Amino acid sequence: AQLRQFYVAAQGISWSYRPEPTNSSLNLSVTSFKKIVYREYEPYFKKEKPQSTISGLLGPTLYAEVGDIIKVHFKNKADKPLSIHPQGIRYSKLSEGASYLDHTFPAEKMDDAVAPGREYTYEWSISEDSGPTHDDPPCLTHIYYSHENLIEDFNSGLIGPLLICKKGTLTEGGTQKTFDKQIVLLFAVFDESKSWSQSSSLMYTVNGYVNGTMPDITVCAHDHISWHLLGMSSGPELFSIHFNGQVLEQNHHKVSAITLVSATSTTANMTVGPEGKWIISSLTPKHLQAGMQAYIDIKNCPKKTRNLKKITREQRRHMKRWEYFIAAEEVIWDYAPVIPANMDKKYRSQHLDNFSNQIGKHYKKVMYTQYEDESFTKHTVNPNMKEDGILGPIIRAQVRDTLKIVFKNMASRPYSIYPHGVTFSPYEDEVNSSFTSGRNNTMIRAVQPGETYTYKWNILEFDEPTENDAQCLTRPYYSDVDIMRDIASGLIGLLLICKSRSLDRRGIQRAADIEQQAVFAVFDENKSWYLEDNINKFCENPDEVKRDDPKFYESNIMSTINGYVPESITTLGFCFDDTVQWHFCSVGTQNEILTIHFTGHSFIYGKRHEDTLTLFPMRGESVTVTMDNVGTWMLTSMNSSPRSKKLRLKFRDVKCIPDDDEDSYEIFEPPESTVMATRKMHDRLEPEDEESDADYDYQNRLAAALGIRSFRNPDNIAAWYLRSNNGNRRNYYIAAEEISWDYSEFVQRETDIEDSDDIPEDTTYKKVVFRKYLDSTFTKRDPRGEYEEHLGILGPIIRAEVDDVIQVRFKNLASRPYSLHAHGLSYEKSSEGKTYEDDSPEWFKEDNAVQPNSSYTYVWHATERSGPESPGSACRAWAYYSAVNPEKDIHSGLIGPLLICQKGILHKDSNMPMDMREFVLLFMTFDEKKSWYYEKKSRSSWRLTSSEMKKSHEFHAINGMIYSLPGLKMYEQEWVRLHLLNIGGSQDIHVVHFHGQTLLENGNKQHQLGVWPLLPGSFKTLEMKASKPGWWLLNTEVGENQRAGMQTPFLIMDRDCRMPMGLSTGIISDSQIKASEFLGYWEPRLARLNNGGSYNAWSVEKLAAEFASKPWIQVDMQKEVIITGIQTQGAKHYLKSCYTTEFYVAYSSNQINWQIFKGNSTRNVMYFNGNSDASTIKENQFDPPIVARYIRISPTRAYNRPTLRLELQGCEVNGCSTPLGMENGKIENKQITASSFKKSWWGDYWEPFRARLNAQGRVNAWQAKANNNKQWLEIDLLKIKKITAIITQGCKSLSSEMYVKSYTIHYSEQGVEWKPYRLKSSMVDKIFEGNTNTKGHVKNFFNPPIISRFIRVIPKTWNQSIALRLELFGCDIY
């Protein structure tokens, strides 16, 4: 419950990018840079903290436990305004530091920009729902920075960690209990060109140190450590950190490489091993050449040395000849193999053969070849094993299988090998570290061209992966001499860290029948060590050497998959009910990443069945696909020209007829023959069939341990295929049709207060967008309700259920063909829509293309592996798009979500899944040069793409529109679901950040993450739990996209928006009640709910016939308000039943453009509902609340006279004018003080302690003792609050009434004082207008709110007495 007070300051530190403690060159410092950073101070800024060395510009580290507060006492000592902005849920509008359009008063604008040489005070509060609190890591990490200028105030060196932790861990010194260290690492890129002192800089630093000049950080050996890896850069960078020789554990995944994208952070743990130096490598092929790393030296502290189990429990020893005698060679390589079916013209007759005498016959291509003999006298296989081809030398490592790597360099250059996540033994280095010790304890890394060598490491059962990880981990191994040059030469393999899966010393696996190796390498011959043996030596046209030319240079860029370019001419055939296991990885001198769409099936991923994998550069991943379909399919990547339409691997999934191995070309080894016949899978040894590795007779010691001991103790067609699926079908009628569409919705009267913003692009653009119609015969559409206001460009949400069956009658209506393609779903090739080779005549090709003005009816089947796993969640998002040309279609607008929810989620609202809010958002940047309707020579510049506005034709949209995206409205403290998707703009990884909010995952039931990184292809379902009302801001915190256009001001409102908007009270005067048609004589100024008299309903003139037309009454508000319901009522004089039954509602913010859609609205199908009898107050609710100035209702069907009385239910503007609790009872009577509890001597007592609005009983107001202009009513709010508005009233006693008429307001500070309320733009006090009638209310507003907890009300001029019932509308500030 403590308060983490913190003193910070910002000063201009002259900072070179390296440290040096000398003199001669340390006065004349040749290189330097101006910088502004964060430096912590002792209280009152007298002294200054030590500022440990390893943190160069990384500012002070803030921290807290769940429950405490933070009072950062900022003080800007630099010469430009600055601020501080953390990440999470805490900040109210005066402690967030960001200055955007949120409609706040000049009081809460001070935190946004602190002038140079001025103080402030930042206060936060770590709630119970912003911390981990469960199986999350012991405690998380967030980055705090400057929000005044997200680009000029970061590269100037303004950043710092914010390390919030879990209740019960953090000590007083700011260090965890069990952990022995608290390290923080800032991988960053400080572009000094976009900085305060704009000088060019090629800086790829870490903490402010370049090329690895950071001083060595060191710890002891065999202890537990805690990491905190930040990362931040203006541009969209990527940091694939790698810990050499060690293993980490983030997110319960025993990973050996942590990936961070810009403006993100994470925490992780590891236990250090024996001593010896190490390196923190950055795997990204760009952060390598640049040069950035650290050093991990390990000391030897004389405290304790552990002694644990060495042998594998004395039974699973497995000590035999299962070592590996690998080597290197330079054999001939055919990228397209010898005489394939699908020949290629480029690589054959221009790059291998002597046809037109290009090179010769030979490629000098190195590869790790595997000899099975020790003496290196024979390869293991010269031909192939019927299904491998180039399945690499498989290195399967498990507990003590005598894994010895014998190595015989037989090449013409120094080479080596280097695995991943494999600690070395000091007998042989197995790494190219600098300090290779002397001849005594030697550690050799390279091998000269002709030598031999011997490595040594056999893993034991001491680093088994977590159960949440995959079955068989996969890791590469390559030549560590020069990575980019050696891998290009062709040195790479797979190192498989499986589990205790050995049944025999041959090493077969279980739980995965068939396995296939697939890596995505890209051999850049221009960076190979045999280009000279390609053009220089072996050649016949070197006459004028082809080089430095776009043709020749890019022609030898051979991006392949397992080397072989053309095709696996044997498509990967399979059986049914099998569980194939795949191993994925990728290398190549290229920064970008890949995503591998898996057409047709899906694979388990942490018990979720995802269908797209984003594999990162130079680190692998393993999946498991199941055979539950029949037909041909694909495995494709889709990023851009060289890889999208190229990387494909066709593979069957079939059997015919029994199991397909009686007369066919897939004879496996069961062999599905007569059951009485012999083959593999039936190898009965002496004892019995496969049980284990045979050992002692019984060896009673057959207990499996826990790992580490628990120690410390007309084409109107329909669907046709739904015959055997036997489904609970659900029908939809989509279409596709052109439309005009311009992203900029703020100039569409959203936030266009300006009048001179010159449009820098085209006015609008012609897209093609999905729609939703009502039946098989079209032209009867379904308009987008209030729910679908934020969809923007996405089609209709196609919802479903587990084990359902979907029928979709797509019907193209555009100029070129289109189609559909689901994801993670089940269908047939005649229900796929993808364009490639099939297994039938153009009968299965009926869906592959939907010609214009026609229609096809797909049949999709959502099975068990297509539903939302991870019981912590409810619905599972997905996507569908026009997959005829998947790159130019999605960039045209044809994209939509496809949700799948569990069994039970659907209400009697057409049975479409409902019962929990959900916003769907597709973060994507739209390119107009990749669409179909891209008129090339636009009217700005025809030569280049608007050379006058270069690259102005790419729009960073947030789900359609830009800067506006209206429709995002949530309550306070309500669980809303979010389906964030990203498949359009691939190479741009996005990180989603809501202001003042903390997201959440499920499955493992707990994950906060602060902000989430959207991987291009992932489908993420999260939960929000909105925090506080006001105008917040949704964006992506990559500073060069937040300013580019990805920022939407979503809205949190109050959680009690149920207050009358003035109809019954009297706020809404009768000067603004209109009517088109009328009912007799009953003036509409008398349409007030619960109004008595003789005429109490709506009319102006006489009707004489009213049953068919739809008259209307129009209420005005004079300001934009919220409306969350309506309170209907019936009228009569003595004998008119006269009630309305059905009635719809319109609304408008301009009185001209009306949106009549809340009657037959979203939750409704095509109707609304109303009253049931005479005066019995009946009310309805607008589930998505509406917000408009004018509102107009129209009754259709009533009882013999369509009358009504209406009363509205809304809230306010800033969005926190909630009842402070007077009438609610949330305030007790001990927060009200005044002068006299005025009593008579022949009657009652006049209580200034019952000033409740609309509370009834005895004298329930404050008639002061004696009349004078010097009484008052003082309210002690018990904590400083923002007092927004006031409502006065009048009182009486059964007789002549009297009431206040005009009052002034004296208020206080935190303490006891009283000061007048001088009008902002005046020189004297402000005067208010009190009541005018007895019971009617009057609302008075404050131009700036009164931020206090003392407030006095001065009755200045009144009517014959002081008397009022009072209610303040305030806000719970902190």
mmCIF file of C-alpha atoms in Angstrom, residues 640-734:
data_model
loop_
_atom_site.group_PDB
_atom_site.id
_atom_site.type_symbol
_atom_site.label_atom_id
_atom_site.label_comp_id
_atom_site.label_asym_id
_atom_site.label_seq_id
_atom_site.Cartn_x
_atom_site.Cartn_y
_atom_site.Cartn_z
ATOM 1 C CA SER A 640 5.181 -10.059 -52.868
ATOM 2 C CA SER A 641 6.337 -10.879 -56.393
ATOM 3 C CA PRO A 642 9.351 -13.207 -55.913
ATOM 4 C CA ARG A 643 7.797 -15.462 -53.261
ATOM 5 C CA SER A 644 3.989 -15.212 -53.234
ATOM 6 C CA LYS A 645 3.061 -16.962 -56.484
ATOM 7 C CA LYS A 646 6.236 -19.087 -56.345
ATOM 8 C CA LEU A 647 6.588 -20.885 -52.988
ATOM 9 C CA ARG A 648 4.073 -23.691 -53.415
ATOM 10 C CA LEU A 649 4.137 -27.406 -52.561
ATOM 11 C CA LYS A 650 1.229 -29.383 -54.006
ATOM 12 C CA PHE A 651 0.268 -32.406 -51.920
ATOM 13 C CA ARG A 652 -2.543 -34.952 -52.095
ATOM 14 C CA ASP A 653 -4.630 -36.166 -49.173
ATOM 15 C CA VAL A 654 -6.243 -39.092 -50.731
ATOM 16 C CA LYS A 655 -6.800 -42.770 -50.836
ATOM 17 C CA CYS A 656 -8.499 -44.942 -53.599
ATOM 18 C CA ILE A 657 -10.076 -47.296 -53.305
ATOM 19 C CA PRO A 658 -9.470 -49.422 -50.122
ATOM 20 C CA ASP A 659 -6.582 -47.297 -48.685
ATOM 21 C CA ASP A 660 -5.080 -46.498 -52.206
ATOM 22 C CA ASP A 661 -2.176 -49.041 -52.032
ATOM 23 C CA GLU A 662 -3.671 -51.982 -53.964
ATOM 24 C CA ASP A 663 -3.259 -50.554 -57.482
ATOM 25 C CA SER A 664 -1.719 -47.060 -57.307
ATOM 26 C CA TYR A 665 1.612 -45.258 -56.877
ATOM 27 C CA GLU A 666 1.871 -44.696 -53.107
ATOM 28 C CA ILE A 667 2.841 -48.140 -51.826
ATOM 29 C CA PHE A 668 3.800 -47.443 -48.200
ATOM 30 C CA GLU A 669 4.966 -49.936 -45.597
ATOM 31 C CA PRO A 670 1.938 -51.209 -43.674
ATOM 32 C CA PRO A 671 1.402 -52.030 -46.716
ATOM 33 C CA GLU A 672 -2.437 -51.984 -46.448
ATOM 34 C CA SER A 673 -2.335 -55.434 -48.064
ATOM 35 C CA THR A 674 -4.262 -58.447 -46.870
ATOM 36 C CA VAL A 675 -4.082 -58.247 -43.082
ATOM 37 C CA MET A 676 -2.418 -61.661 -42.941
ATOM 38 C CA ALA A 677 0.728 -60.284 -44.689
ATOM 39 C CA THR A 678 4.009 -58.979 -43.304
ATOM 40 C CA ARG A 679 5.715 -55.578 -43.466
ATOM 41 C CA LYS A 680 7.003 -52.934 -41.030
ATOM 42 C CA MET A 681 4.938 -51.833 -37.991
ATOM 43 C CA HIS A 682 5.011 -55.570 -37.057
ATOM 44 C CA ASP A 683 8.486 -56.284 -35.636
ATOM 45 C CA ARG A 684 7.980 -58.663 -32.722
ATOM 46 C CA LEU A 685 11.267 -59.170 -30.882
ATOM 47 C CA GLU A 686 12.088 -62.016 -28.489
ATOM 48 C CA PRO A 687 9.837 -60.800 -25.604
ATOM 49 C CA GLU A 688 6.986 -59.187 -27.545
ATOM 50 C CA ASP A 689 6.221 -56.348 -29.962
ATOM 51 C CA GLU A 690 7.615 -52.824 -29.511
ATOM 52 C CA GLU A 691 7.632 -51.885 -25.816
ATOM 53 C CA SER A 692 10.982 -50.163 -25.116
ATOM 54 C CA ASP A 693 14.688 -50.815 -25.568
ATOM 55 C CA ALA A 694 15.294 -54.299 -24.196
ATOM 56 C CA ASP A 695 17.220 -54.352 -20.916
ATOM 57 C CA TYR A 696 17.451 -56.392 -17.707
ATOM 58 C CA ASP A 697 14.743 -59.037 -17.252
ATOM 59 C CA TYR A 698 12.196 -56.860 -15.432
ATOM 60 C CA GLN A 699 14.123 -53.857 -13.991
ATOM 61 C CA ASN A 700 11.387 -52.942 -11.492
ATOM 62 C CA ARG A 701 12.595 -49.320 -11.678
ATOM 63 C CA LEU A 702 9.957 -48.328 -14.246
ATOM 64 C CA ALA A 703 8.788 -45.079 -12.656
ATOM 65 C CA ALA A 704 8.763 -41.880 -14.700
ATOM 66 C CA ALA A 705 9.940 -38.901 -12.642
ATOM 67 C CA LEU A 706 8.613 -35.322 -12.724
ATOM 68 C CA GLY A 707 11.705 -33.928 -14.454
ATOM 69 C CA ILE A 708 13.252 -31.722 -11.782
ATOM 70 C CA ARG A 709 12.342 -33.190 -8.387
ATOM 71 C CA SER A 710 9.674 -31.450 -6.283
ATOM 72 C CA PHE A 711 12.561 -30.500 -4.023
ATOM 73 C CA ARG A 712 12.802 -27.762 -1.335
ATOM 74 C CA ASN A 713 11.011 -30.194 1.009
ATOM 75 C CA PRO A 714 -31.727 -16.247 -63.812
ATOM 76 C CA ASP A 715 -29.039 -17.739 -61.543
ATOM 77 C CA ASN A 716 -31.106 -18.233 -58.388
ATOM 78 C CA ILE A 717 -29.119 -21.353 -57.503
ATOM 79 C CA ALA A 718 -28.794 -22.988 -54.073
ATOM 80 C CA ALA A 719 -26.384 -25.370 -52.322
ATOM 81 C CA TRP A 720 -25.836 -28.975 -53.341
ATOM 82 C CA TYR A 721 -23.107 -30.682 -51.258
ATOM 83 C CA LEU A 722 -24.828 -30.696 -47.835
ATOM 84 C CA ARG A 723 -25.767 -34.373 -48.008
ATOM 85 C CA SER A 724 -23.324 -36.314 -45.802
ATOM 86 C CA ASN A 725 -22.186 -33.362 -43.679
ATOM 87 C CA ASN A 726 -25.568 -33.722 -41.917
ATOM 88 C CA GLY A 727 -25.520 -30.207 -40.575
ATOM 89 C CA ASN A 728 -27.587 -27.606 -38.746
ATOM 90 C CA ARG A 729 -27.317 -25.325 -41.732
ATOM 91 C CA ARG A 730 -27.201 -21.528 -41.662
ATOM 92 C CA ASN A 731 -27.751 -19.499 -44.818
ATOM 93 C CA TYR A 732 -26.277 -16.225 -46.072
ATOM 94 C CA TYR A 733 -26.557 -14.244 -49.317
ATOM 95 C CA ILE A 734 -23.400 -12.211 -49.984
#
